[PDB]
Structure formats: C-alpha cells, structure tokens
C-alpha cells in the first residue's frame, strides 16, 4: 500500500437519488420499503444539535 494513497478509503459525499438507482444499489426487486431504504446522511456539527438529513427521492 502506498502511504495515504491506496489506503484509507474515503466515502462518497452522497448516495443514489433516483429510486431506480437506490434499488440498483441495494438489490431491491420491487416495492419493498423503498423510501426507508434510502441512505440518510448524518450532520453532527458541534455547535448545533445533531440530526440526519434524507434526500428527496426522484422518479
């Protein structure tokens, strides 16, 4: 492993937004709790109360 290059995988800032893409990612076939299988991004800044933000799904 190259130091700091090929290790310490960083995450994507945001996941799928189109319901087809959420189903493609999570291997959903059809009509199984799609709106609650979406990824919720947690905001946890020190100066404010923590909460989690969910994206507005499309299609």
């Amino acid at each position: 492993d190259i130091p700091g290059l090929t290790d310490t995988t960083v995450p994507r800032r945001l996941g799928p937004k189109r319901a087809s893409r959420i189903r493609k990612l999570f291997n959903l076939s059809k009509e199984d709790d799609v709106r609650q299988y979406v990824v919720r991004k947690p905001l946890n800044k020190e100066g404010k109360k923590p909460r989690t933000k969910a994206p507005k799904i499309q299609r």
Partner: protein, 116 residues
C-alpha cells in the same frame, strides 16, 4: 541520435543529411536529398511518384473492452451498512413487504373510520 525526421518521400532522414526548408507562411519542410526537394519545389504530388511511401501506401504496395464497477462506502452508510441492507434477501425483504402491507391496511381502515 537526435529527433528523427521524415521527408517529402516519407523516408527517414538521419542527422547530418538533407536540407530543411522554412516557408514564409510558417510551414517547415525537410527533405532527404535534392531529388526530393526538387519534386516538392516543382509542386509535384508525392502520391503519383512510385518510390514515395505515400504512393506505396495509397496503392497498398507491400502491405481493450471492460466494465469494472468498484464498490465504495458513502456518507451515512458504510460498506458494511450497504452490505447488510442488500443482504436482506432471506425473508427479511418479505417481512418488510408484509409489514408495509399491514401498515397500509391499518392506515386505510383508520381513514375509513375517520371519514365515517
């Protein structure tokens, strides 16, 4: 062992050979010998001269794919998180489907009761 140049005739011009011609319009040409430079300066077409490589190429004389998807973690849902979500195949997905079904049923019954 300098840069290796090519001619009017397309031949290889080694260092110390030929002449370089710099035209007024900025174009720079180099020739292997005076035979090539005379043909060029007389506006002769190299594709009509049989020993030129352009003729031998015009007349044909003598002669990957992949799709890799790499999985990555995302903010809020780690790689293990998305693995646990996508591995809900053994009847967990069916359990979620049936609990959604009964939630819809109880919502509809509550709506009917409230309307009536």
């Amino acid at each position: 062992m300098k840069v290796e140049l090519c001619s009017f005739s397309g031949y290889k011009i080694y260092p110390g050979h030929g002449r370089r011609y710099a035209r007024t319009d900025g174009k720079v040409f180099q020739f292997l010998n005076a035979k090539c430079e005379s043909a060029f300066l007389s506006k002769r077409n190299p594709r009509q001269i049989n020993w030129t490589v352009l003729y031998r190429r015009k007349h044909k004389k003598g002669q990957t794919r992949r799709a890799v998807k790499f999985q990555r973690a995302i903010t809020g849902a780690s790689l293990a998180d998305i693995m646990a979500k996508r591995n809900q195949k053994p009847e967990v997905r069916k359990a979620q489907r049936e609990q959604a079904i009964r939630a819809a049923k109880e919502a509809k019954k509550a709506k009917q009761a409230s309307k009536k």
